[PDB]
A paper describes a structure:
Lymphostatin is a key virulence factor of enteropathogenic and enterohaemorrhagic Escherichia coli, playing roles in bacterial colonisation of the gut and in the inhibition of lymphocyte proliferation and proinflammatory responses. Here, we describe the structure of lymphostatin from enteropathogenic E. coli O127:H6, determined by electron cryo-microscopy at different pH values. We observe three conformations of a highly complex molecule with two glycosyltransferase domains, one PaToxP-like protease domain, an ADP-ribosyltransferase domain, a vertex domain and a delivery domain. Long linkers hold these domains together and occlude the catalytic sites of the N-terminal glycosyltransferase and protease domains.
Under these conditions, we observed conformation II and another, extended conformation (conformation III, ca. 40% of LifA at pH 8.0), which was absent at the tested lower pH values. Vice versa, conformation I had disappeared, which suggested that conformation I was a low-pH form and conformation III was a high-pH form. In conformation II it was close to the centre of LifA and in contact with the vertex domain and in conformation III the ART-domain was on the other side of the protease domain. The subdomain organisation of the C-terminal arm in conformation II was also maintained in conformation III. However, in conformation III the whole C-terminal arm rotated as a rigid body by 180° around linker L-IV placing the N-terminus of the S1-subdomain at the distal tip of the extended LifA. Concomitant with the reorientation of the C-terminal arm, the linker L-IV changed into an extended conformation and spanned the whole distance between the vertex domain and the distal end of LifA. In conformation III, the subdomains S2 and the C-terminus of S1 were adjacent to the protease domain. S1 formed several interactions with the N-terminal helix of the protease domain. One of these interactions was a π-cation interaction between H1448 and R2628. Such an interaction can only occur at high pH when the histidine is deprotonated and thus can contribute to the pH-dependent stabilisation of conformation III.
Residue numbers in the entry: 242 to 997, 1036 to 1780
Amino acid sequence: ANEIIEIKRIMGEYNLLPDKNSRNGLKLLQKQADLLKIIMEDTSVTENTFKNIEIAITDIKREYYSHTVDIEKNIHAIWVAGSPPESISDYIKTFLKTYKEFTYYLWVDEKAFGAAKFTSVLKQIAFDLACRTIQQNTPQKNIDFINLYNEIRKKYNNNPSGQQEYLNKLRELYATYQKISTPLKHMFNSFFLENMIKLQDNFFNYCIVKGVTEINDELRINYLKNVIKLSDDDIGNYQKTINDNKDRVKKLILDLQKQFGENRISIKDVNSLTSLSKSENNHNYQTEMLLRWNYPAASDLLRMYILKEHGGIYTDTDMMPAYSKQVIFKIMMQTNGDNRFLEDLKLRRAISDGVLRYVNNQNIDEVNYNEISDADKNIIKKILTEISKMPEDSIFTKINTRIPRDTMPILRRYHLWPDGWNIRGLNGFMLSHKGSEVIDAVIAGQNQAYRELRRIRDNIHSEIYFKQTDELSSLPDTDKIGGILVKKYLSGSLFSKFRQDTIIPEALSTLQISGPDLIQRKMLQFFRSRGVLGEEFINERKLSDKAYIGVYKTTGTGKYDWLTPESIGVNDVTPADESTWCIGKGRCVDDFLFKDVSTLKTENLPELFLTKIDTDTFFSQWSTKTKKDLQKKIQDLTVRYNELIDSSTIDFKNLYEIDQMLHMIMLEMNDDIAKRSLFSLQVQISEKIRRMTIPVDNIINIYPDLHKKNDNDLSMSIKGFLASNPHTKINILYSNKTEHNIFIKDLFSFAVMENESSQEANEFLEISTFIYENDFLREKIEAVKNKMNSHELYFEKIKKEQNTWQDLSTKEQKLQLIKALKEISGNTEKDSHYDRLLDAFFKKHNENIHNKIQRIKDEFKEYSRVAIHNIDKVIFKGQTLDRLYHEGYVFSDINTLSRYTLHGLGITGVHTEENLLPAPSSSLINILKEHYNEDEISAKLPLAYDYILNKKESSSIPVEILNKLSELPPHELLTPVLGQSVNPLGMGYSSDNGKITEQVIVSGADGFDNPISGLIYTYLEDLYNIHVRMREGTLNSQNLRQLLENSVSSCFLTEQSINKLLSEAEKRPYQSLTEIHQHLTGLPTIADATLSLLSVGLPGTGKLLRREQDYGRPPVTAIQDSTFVLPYNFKGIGFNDNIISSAPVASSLHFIAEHAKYTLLSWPEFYRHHAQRWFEMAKGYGSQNIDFHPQSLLVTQEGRCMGLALLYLQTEDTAHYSILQENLMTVSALHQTSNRDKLPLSKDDNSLMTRTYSLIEMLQYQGNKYITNESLLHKTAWNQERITLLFNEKGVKRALISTPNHTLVLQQLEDIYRLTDPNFGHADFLSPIDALKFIEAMIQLTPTLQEYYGLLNKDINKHIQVHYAESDMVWNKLLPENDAGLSTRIQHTTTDRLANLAEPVAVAGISLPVKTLYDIGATLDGRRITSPPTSEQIPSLRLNGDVLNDYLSRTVLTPEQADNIRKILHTQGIRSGTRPIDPEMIRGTQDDLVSSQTRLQRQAT
């Protein structure tokens, strides 16, 4: 019925429109067709009659229409720097002659004539940095390619007479480059692309600091001077190139305007486009300046910008209009039955050359005719003579002018390669009208493609090696892109000599980021999104012939019909094509600018290098005035700045202070070089913030909507997350108060309407049609909504028991509810849907919500992990969210506030409102790709998930695929929450199309500091206060400023904000917290506000991070890798993640036996019985340093202790190793004291323990994932000689020795090989062979130990694996560098902190040091003491019992403090949660004669 009434509404609206041939009419038609398609496909009432289906199909054939729009009379072309004008002018003239009323525009970037020199300088800087990095990562092997390259760079010498020689030498050197091993080539590609990205980011930060709103040539010159030592000769060369290009453009345009008139052809400046400076496009044009390997071609973004802005026809300056009927006919008549002239490229190219010369009144028979037989030469000559005899103005025909609304036809090209016909679309020719939707779709696709390209940098934990086993389809894969860039850099230019088939590298076309293939893909997706109007353009997952232009008939009973094309195209086969630009036409050598990079200013590139400041060289450029004025501030800043940079954790107090004072130094200093140095410091701080990441606690929280009809999606999500990981704790949160308030709202709304089941449906549709046929239509809808909201406001205002108490009972107290509804109603009657039919409605409401909850509970009653929580019981009394619940809050964002409040309370992990699913793993995608196509995976995944979870087989998937899916464990096919990382600022955020939304909130692990949570708490309190003030109707500037005078959220307090807030308050007082947020800040979501809040505490780095968002960089609060997908299209929520191609590797979990021994009380037995044996074995093979630091964190062998192993891989020197060792000892002691003895810890110790455990879990998952993957780490079987030659010859610093149940670490610390086993500690050796023999012997130590490692009664040589990598930055990329400071800082327990200070406190009339008071254990409101209590905290200081009893169990406590403790215990009390202890603090043991001797000796000394 809803579908029928929607049909009626849409027909009513569409027939009354000012112009049906527009966007909204097309949208209405599309949605009508879609819903009618559902209706026909819906067997709701049988299949009706074949006649009804016939009616439906005739109707859908009818309603399509055409809605044709004309095209603007404009022709566009893009001028490319260095293009000779004498070649372009011919095609300009031909297009002007063919199209009479069209206006030709030549688009020229006046401010980028020198961009080629700048880009080449950046490219060679990047290549030299990559070469240096690769050389330093492979010191054992001397790569001769690098030596040859450096030798060539040295022998460059003379510039003017050696540029061509240098280019040719590089051309030959590419052949030598194509000889190194494949991993080296991958290293070059990855490093080269990454270095370009970093250099572009450095240039953009230079633009940010300089405060420039436009990028022009002298800005590039200044940047080059500030980066490299740029001389005056180079600036002269740059300016000469700029002037030469300007003169060429001026000459060309002057000649053309003289011959045709200065009104038909003119010149446009691309900087007039409003899309270059648009924030969404984030300056991808500048990036394309650099990441471009088809130099002679124009840019791909500018075409789309031009077509969107002005519209019309875009053409390349290398193309001619298509021939007319007569020309083709005469060509056939002069060749008889030889169709080779119209199909072979060479012959038609010669014909095109001849016709082009003829039309422009040049020497007709001067055609090249190269490599053409004499007979064909003569035939072409007669053909050209016949054409020349034919009058002009009839040789070229015009393309179709009319066009469907919101579409972009694409030129189609047919070529006759030796292997057959190649038919592809080209971006060389387009048609569009001003502002069509497909242009916007293609632009969005280009932005997404550029974001995905910038993934090797923006993502810390990327992939370096892929094995390139299978690669096809879209392929944005960075490895191939880097390969093409290296090809372009070294081997001159592309297209050299021969290129695959007929000088056409199709692989290039499939690899182009924004080439024709991306446009085709986005057009296909747009047409699919159109609906039932779209399949006319869709032909079996490919674009049909209707989308393209210049389509020839496919059925010519042999070849094609070159007489009557379906649509008219253009003659893209042109003598000035790339076939001449490759060899014949002179290659552009003005685009290269040699620059030796031995003079690189390393200290001015914070993104590339990490520089620690000092007082010697940091001030070697400042002016004397600023010197000795701010030099001292920087000098005493160094000590904190260097330790902040060289740290594993982030101290937010230190960071706040450092950044605030750097910003202060900025604001009060007037200089340009010192400001640049301090900005470099700020950029280093920002990069440090971005590199740090903290784990997530493997918890998913789902806040479902209990009003959706379908409930299988939530069950599917819960089951998928249960199957993804055997430790993922699932929480489902709801709120009885929220739905109760929703029900009351609906009741009041229906009542206030009253103030104004087939039979009931028929009556309602009759009433709706009756009011649609008279004045009640289009006159009271907005009245209904305004009146209901105003009466909701008024009912909120009156505040009776129905409001404050909300009638939470509804058992007997429905009587006053009914009489109140009568009072609010204007019926002045009885039982008017109030005494009757209302109790039934209430019963329906409660039964629906409660049965949904009951089904959710019962379906997962056997799983202890799935917990159903009620929000009303978790929140505290009197909080913001509690007051929102109590007063009555029914806005759609109440769930967002609930997520924020619940995270503030303490529950961590992912928070989401919709039904997320774990992302498919790489194995699942590989299985799917073995039978399907990449574009089909997104549609076939729901069936695969159904079969994996519910075991529901489908007929749409081959049985072999189902068997393969059933073969693998479910947790090998889905990606769990565990292992995901977030920014150290705290809460992350999901994203779409670059922007960040509130669909998913991923919070950091518990224990780690979280500033965003506190900022959100304070800001939500402020928003609630503002809400209350607007509700009361008493708000003005004064009290608004006073209400926000103490909180951080006062940086939004501008005049316009005040005016907007007051106007909105006067318009509609009762508004939502998110709406108030939008009115106050101007940002759409709270997620966008958080960075602004943080910039109050980080005035320098906060603004820098915000300002880098619109320069291509991801938001600092965004998520890189998405392990979640949405359950309606299966698209990742990540910023630059594509789940289909970049799928995460499956992690092999480790499972132990259920009877696993060594509980927490019995684990020390293992060390107790094996430590001495381990020591003897270590001494029996030669070891000068043996140290024991056994762990008590992991009693069982789950994860085979791999997490701990990875921590020992984090260190690379002995000092950091010792720091990590002692910190792990402290954490194990804390864990033993907490869990084994059941003694509560202090807040600091508990947080440290939680952080260490979260890190251990995350590293365990990551290590298990890395072990079972071959591209990342090279697995090897046990072989002593192989391993020792691996360390000696190949060169490896770190390796993991993995057994079935354990993991050992082997490092080359300094010159001494350290073998670490988390049990028994580490042993040092002077040679790898000794370490390997000791490992094998240590395995064969005791049958208990051998069994405990899972090597009992099994061969050792075939069950121990060795894992390593080819270079150490592989390890640096895999291992996260935010390890909570365990490897750099010495973590002090609260007892050590209290012992450090010496200040006894006066408690109960006696003096007691704070350390001893803590050791006794003093609980303030159920929490240990961390600071010395003041005079107002003593009476409330209780005493802990268990801690005290343990304290007596440990120490002897001589009477001199035993009496003091007696006084403390009697004066104070014992907290009820602990147990009482009898006073038995005495000391009378032994004799104090040894005490006499000890004091005698100490006085002696």
